[PDB]
């Protein structure tokens, strides 16, 4: 680039060698008896002389592994005679040693002074790594070569990894360079990524062993960034094979991430909704099933379940997605004056306007703003229910500001309108707490008081969807379900309509077998 | 029109790359130190054939099940493995003893004729990693430098 | 009434597409998560031995790396004079050991070669390796079967079991098919 000359072939000798020496009996295993007499060479041919002449030596060293790789890659195809496993070895083989190089500098760096060099050189090799990866990704392009740095990247975690308060350093460096590598950025790292992110090392430090859970917000940015990448693809139905298998990918983890760890899903289900489009019902559903573990949730199937008497419908869940955000300082104001006076009267007849963000022809409405607002009007409403000295019913619920903007909304909105507000209600019916009451209550009186078939199709079709599909459903969902059956106004409108469409009927009989 | 240009030019790039990243996906030994001896071939099998292994077979119980053949198969053939590390556990439970020097498996075919705090004399039978067998040698000296 | 895609009608239109759709995912439908080689029934953690985004199977003690005492790092001292890995050399337990633990690999395969080389036959039903039993023929070799003394490895007690039995060929397996492909990466076409 603006390499001092003889520098490229003066540190492609230097790992050329320490390649040999990484290998050789004599190393001492960790490779610390070779490391001494190589840091010792390293400061005779003067590379580690400057910043920028530590930085250059790093890049150059990078760079060498990678065209060791290109050329593996080329006399295996060039020769289908040669075997793969012994040209993936001659990979590792070079990978590996300046992995123990990088991992043996930036442990002696924090030996010889502290913790905050140790992580300042741990970050300046990951910069220089993502830097390569990067360049190469653009030039190559559909050549481009994901093996070395994913080698690099999960060998050098794994070997930094075995205080605990200094291992959070290391993981939030390794997490700043999976940010900087997320699929949006490296398209083609994508499944050398999710390998990373989701690896079971990985996992553990950040998700369990990381204490008073500081790693949860940032492995929830990590998997926004997955689901942020997938959206365009998900949202447009058809998905290429290489996009079913990292789909199945993220299936596999959310899965791992439902069983062992469901507060984590739990808490960040709002985060993951405004990115996942609405589709994508059991992607979803898999969010919206996770429940603290030590929760017993009665059985949705018990005839006769009251569940107006169970203890859980006062506790409100936790939500560490600060939603309220979204909403433009204005319009919040705005909001706030209608739910305590009920004006101004124009604020519901502007409303829609305000939630249809419509500069492009296909967004159509700001989605992010519609659950933001719907959310928020409940979590105002349940507060405002109990401040009045009510737990939130069938019959406390109505004939308040809160339930103006629902009724309102469920009115004046199109059919698109109203699929995604309704699809905002669906996504907090879930374990039993209060939002969960309250919004299948909202549900439950928006069906009942409807004067337009559209209405009651609509929540019919948003409830159906989302217990069609094959499991986790969840709790919330199958209680209003269950609920709204039984209702006459439902009874009606099934008689009305399975007259009409009969193939609908089928939908129905399905639920009886599908559902948990 | 055709509903793919609905995506964005941007949209359309990442597809391609991810599409030319599944031609070469990576592979289960790419995330793996380098295994020597029996490295991954993963290929297709039949249905009825057991795709996966017993249930707890990584237990130090089932390793003691095997045969000591097996086990030294997995201590040489496995090297720097959870499951060399069960075939070590259960060869020392039924009474094996690694030579640090000869790096070989020995056990007491007889109470041995001499213990000092330097050595222990007397028969042994070990298991030959280069003739692939069980052998016995009578007087020999285990020096307890070469014993953990 | 909905004429749209967001009402009823759009519903079982998404349903009735998954039957003319030959792509894995149907967002509409979804898809047998039980199946996707995680066990969901599982009282302890899965992350442990979660192998990747893409495998069906979890993390066997061989995959998982593990800091052995120095002293088992034979191999670097070893190398020349350690023998070479010949299937005809080791025992039944052995062929047994490689068999059950290489679950979609080609030392599975491989195995199950020595095995059936060594006379042993796979019942596709019964799901286990029988053999002749010393001294016992058959009762009547006939057509599609045959009925007499047989051994079988139990995989749970780790033993060979004499279980007296009627196979019919029919549910017996051939001469394993050796997969001729080097370059197979499963992580590819999973679904």
Same mark, same amino acid.
């Given at each position: 680039?603006?390499?001092?000359?003889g520098?490229?072939?003066?540190?492609?000798?230097?790992?050329?060698?320490?390649?040999?020496?990484?290998?050789?009996?004599?190393?001492?295993?960790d490779?610390?008896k070779?490391?001494?007499?190589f840091?010792?060479?390293?400061?005779?041919?003067?590379?580690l002389?400057?910043?920028?002449?530590?930085?250059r030596?790093?890049r150059?060293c990078?760079?060498?592994?990678?065209?060791?790789?290109?050329?593996?890659?080329?006399?295996?195809?060039?020769?289908?005679?040669?075997? *793969?496993?012994?040209?993936?070895?001659?990979?590792?083989?070079?990978?590996?040693?300046?992995?123990?190089?990088?991992?043996?500098?930036?442990?002696?760096?924090?030996?010889?002074?502290?913790?905050?060099?140790?992580?300042?050189?741990?970050?300046?090799?990951?910069?220089?790594?993502? %830097?390569?990866?990067?360049?190469?990704?653009?030039v190559?392009?559909?050549?481009?070569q994901?093996?070395?740095?994913?080698?690099?990247?999960?060998?050098?975690?794994?070997?930094?990894?075995?205080?605990?308060?200094?291992?959070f350093?290391?993981?939030?460096?390794?997490?700043?360079?999976?940010?900087?590598?997320?699929? $949006?950025?490296?398209?083609?790292?994508?499944?050398?990524?999710?390998?990373?992110?989701?690896?079971?090392?990985?996992?553990?430090?950040?998700l369990?062993?990381?204490?008073?859970?500081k790693?949860?917000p940032?492995y929830?940015?990590?998997?926004?960034?997955?689901?942020?990448?997938?959206? *365009?693809?998900?949202?447009?139905?058809?998905?290429?094979?290489?996009?079913?298998?990292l789909?199945?990918?993220?299936?596999?983890?959310?899965?791992?991430?439902?069983?062992?760890?469901?507060?984590?899903?739990?808490?960040?289900?709002?985060?993951?909704?405004?990115?996942?489009?609405?589709n994508?019902?059991?992607?979803?559903?898999?969010?919206?099933?996770?429940?603290? +573990?030590?929760?017993?949730?009665?059985?949705?199937?018990?005839?006769?379940?009251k569940v107006?008497?169970?203890?859980?419908?006062?506790?409100?869940? &936790?939500?560490?997605?600060?939603?309220?955000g979204?909403?433009?300082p204005?319009?919040?104001?705005?909001?706030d004056?209608?739910?305590? $006076?009920?004006? *101004?009267?124009?604020f519901?007849?502007?409303?829609?306007?305000?939630?249809?963000?419509?500069?492009?022809?296909?967004?159509? #409405?700001?989605?992010?703003?519609?659950?933001?607002?719907?959310?928020?009007?409940?979590?105002?409403?349940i507060?405002?229910?109990?401040?009045?000295?009510?737990?939130?019913?069938?019959?406390?619920?109505?004939?308040?500001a809160?339930?103006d903007?629902?009724?309102?909304?469920?009115?004046?909105?199109?059919t698109?309108? +109203?699929?995604?507000?309704?699809?905002?209600?669906?996504?907090?019916?879930?374990?039993?707490?209060?939002?969960?009451?309250?919004?299948?209550?909202?549900?439950?009186?928006?069906f009942?008081?409807?004067?337009?078939?559209?209405?009651?199709?609509?929540?019919?079709?948003?409830?159906?969807?989302?217990?069609?599909?094959?499991?986790?459903?969840?709790?919330?969902?199958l209680?209003?379900?269950?609920?709204?059956?039984?209702?006459?106004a439902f009874?009606?409108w099934?008689?009305?309509?399975?007259?009409?469409?009969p193939?609908?009927?089928?939908?129905?009989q399905?639920?009886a077998?599908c559902?948990? | 029109?055709?509903?793919?240009?609905?995506?964005?030019?941007?949209?359309?790039?990442?597809?391609?790359?991810?599409?030319?990243?599944?031609?070469?996906?990576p592979h289960?030994?790419?995330?793996?130190?380098?295994?020597?001896?029996?490295?991954?071939?993963?290929?297709?099998?039949?249905?009825?054939?057991?795709?996966?292994?017993?249930?707890?077979?990584?237990?130090?119980?089932?390793?003691? &099940?095997?045969?000591?053949?097996?086990?030294?198969?997995?201590?040489?053939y496995?090297?720097?493995?959870?499951?060399?590390?069960?075939?070590?556990?259960?060869?020392?439970?039924?009474?094996?003893?690694?030579?640090?020097?000869?790096?070989?498996?020995?056990?007491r075919?007889?109470?041995?004729?001499?213990?000092?705090?330097?050595?222990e004399?007397?028969?042994?039978?070990?298991?030959?990693?280069?003739?692939?067998?069980?052998?016995?040698?009578? %007087?020999?000296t285990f020096e307890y430098?070469?014993?953990? | 009434?909905?004429?749209?895609?967001?009402?009823?009608? %759009?519903?079982?239109?998404?349903?009735?597409?998954?039957?003319?759709?030959?792509g894995?995912?149907?967002?509409?439908?979804?898809s047998?998560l039980?199946?996707?080689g995680?066990?969901?029934?599982?009282?302890?953690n899965?992350?442990?031995?979660?192998?990747?985004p893409?495998?069906?199977?979890?993390? &066997?003690?061989?995959?998982?790396?593990?800091?052995?005492?120095?002293?088992?790092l034979?191999n670097?001292?070893?190398?020349?004079?350690?023998?070479?890995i010949?299937? %005809?050399?080791?025992?039944?337990?052995?062929?047994?050991?490689? #068999?059950?633990?290489?679950?979609?690999?080609?030392l599975?395969?491989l195995?199950?070669?020595?095995?059936?080389?060594?006379?042993?036959?796979?019942?596709?039903?019964?799901?286990?390796?029988?053999?002749?039993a010393?001294?016992?023929?058959?009762?009547?070799?006939?057509?599609?079967?045959?009925?007499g003394?047989?051994?079988?490895?139990?995989?749970?007690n780790?033993?060979?079991?004499?279980?007296?039995?009627?196979?019919?060929?029919?549910?017996?397996?051939?001469?394993?098919?050796?997969?001729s492909?080097?370059n197979?990466? *499963?992580?590819?076409?999973?679904?």
């Open positions: 680039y603006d390499d001092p000359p520098l490229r072939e003066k540190a492609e000798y230097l790992l050329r060698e320490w390649v040999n020496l990484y290998h050789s009996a004599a190393a001492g295993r490779s610390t070779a490391f001494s007499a840091v010792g060479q390293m400061h005779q041919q003067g590379i002389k400057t910043d920028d002449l530590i930085t030596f790093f150059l990078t760079e060498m592994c990678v065209e060791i790789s290109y050329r593996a890659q080329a006399e295996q195809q060039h020769n289908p005679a040669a075997n *793969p496993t012994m040209i993936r070895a001659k990979c590792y083989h070079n990978l590996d040693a300046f992995v123990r190089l990088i991992a043996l500098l930036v442990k002696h760096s924090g030996e010889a002074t502290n913790t905050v060099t140790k992580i300042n050189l741990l970050n300046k090799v990951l910069g220089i790594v993502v %830097g390569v990866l990067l360049q190469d990704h653009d190559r392009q559909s050549e481009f994901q093996l070395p740095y994913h080698r690099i990247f999960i060998m050098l975690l794994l070997e930094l990894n075995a205080l605990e308060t200094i291992n350093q290391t993981l939030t460096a390794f997490c700043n360079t999976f940010h900087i590598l997320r699929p $949006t950025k490296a398209p083609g790292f994508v499944y050398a990524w999710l390998e990373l992110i989701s690896h079971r090392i990985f996992i553990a430090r950040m369990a062993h990381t204490p008073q859970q790693g949860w940032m929830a940015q990590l998997l926004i960034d997955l689901f942020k990448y997938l959206a *365009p693809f998900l949202r447009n139905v058809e998905l290429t094979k290489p996009m079913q298998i789909y199945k990918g993220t299936l596999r983890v959310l899965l791992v991430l439902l069983h062992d760890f469901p507060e984590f899903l739990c808490d960040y289900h709002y985060g993951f909704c405004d990115v996942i489009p609405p994508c019902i059991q992607l979803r559903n898999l969010i919206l099933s996770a429940f603290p +573990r030590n929760m017993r949730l009665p059985d949705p199937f018990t005839p006769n379940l107006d008497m169970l203890s859980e419908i006062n506790i409100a869940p &936790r939500i560490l997605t600060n939603f309220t979204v909403m433009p204005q319009f919040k104001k705005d909001l004056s209608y739910l305590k $006076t009920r004006s *101004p009267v124009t519901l007849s502007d409303l829609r306007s305000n939630l249809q963000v419509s500069n492009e022809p296909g967004n159509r #409405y700001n989605l992010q703003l519609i659950n933001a607002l719907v959310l928020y009007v409940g979590t105002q409403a507060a405002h229910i109990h401040n009045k000295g009510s737990t939130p019913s069938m019959s406390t619920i109505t004939h308040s809160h339930m903007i629902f009724q309102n909304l469920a009115v004046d909105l199109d698109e309108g +109203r699929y995604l507000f309704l699809n905002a209600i669906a996504n907090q019916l879930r374990y039993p707490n209060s939002h969960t009451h309250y919004f299948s209550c909202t549900m439950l009186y928006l009942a008081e409807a004067n337009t078939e559209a209405i009651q199709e609509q929540i019919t079709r948003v409830l159906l969807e989302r217990l069609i599909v094959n499991r986790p459903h969840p709790w919330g969902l209680i209003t379900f269950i609920e709204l059956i039984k209702n006459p009874k009606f099934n008689h009305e309509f399975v007259e009409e469409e193939e609908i009927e089928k939908l129905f399905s639920v077998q559902c948990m | 029109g055709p509903h793919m240009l609905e995506l964005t030019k941007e949209q359309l790039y990442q597809q391609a790359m991810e599409e030319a990243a599944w031609h070469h996906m289960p030994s790419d995330s793996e130190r380098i295994r020597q001896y029996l490295p991954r071939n993963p290929c297709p099998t039949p249905p009825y054939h057991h795709q996966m292994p017993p249930p707890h077979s990584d237990t130090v119980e089932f390793y003691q &099940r095997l045969s000591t053949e097996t086990l030294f198969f997995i201590f040489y496995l090297e720097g493995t959870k499951a060399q590390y069960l075939a070590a556990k259960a060869l020392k439970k039924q009474s094996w003893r690694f030579h640090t020097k000869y790096m070989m498996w020995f056990q075919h007889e109470e041995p004729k001499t213990i000092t705090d330097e050595f004399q007397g028969t042994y039978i070990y298991f030959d990693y280069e003739k692939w067998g069980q052998r016995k040698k009578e %007087g020999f430098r070469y014993l953990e | 009434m909905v004429t749209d895609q967001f009402g009823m009608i %759009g519903l079982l239109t998404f349903i009735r597409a998954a039957e003319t759709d030959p894995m995912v149907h967002l509409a439908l979804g047998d039980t199946t996707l995680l066990n969901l029934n599982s009282p302890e899965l992350y442990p031995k979660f192998a990747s893409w495998a069906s199977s979890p993390c &066997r003690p061989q995959d998982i790396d593990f800091h052995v005492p120095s002293e088992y034979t670097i001292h070893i190398r020349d004079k350690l023998a070479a010949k299937l %005809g050399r080791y025992g039944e337990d052995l062929l047994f050991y490689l #068999y059950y633990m290489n679950g979609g690999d080609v599975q395969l195995a199950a070669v020595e095995l059936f080389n060594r006379d042993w036959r796979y019942h596709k039903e019964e799901r286990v390796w029988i053999t002749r010393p001294g016992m023929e058959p009762t009547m070799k006939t057509n599609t079967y045959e009925r003394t047989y051994y079988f490895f139990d995989c749970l780790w033993r060979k079991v004499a279980k007296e039995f009627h196979l019919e060929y029919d549910k017996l397996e051939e001469r394993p098919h050796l997969p492909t080097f197979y990466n *499963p992580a590819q076409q999973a679904f």
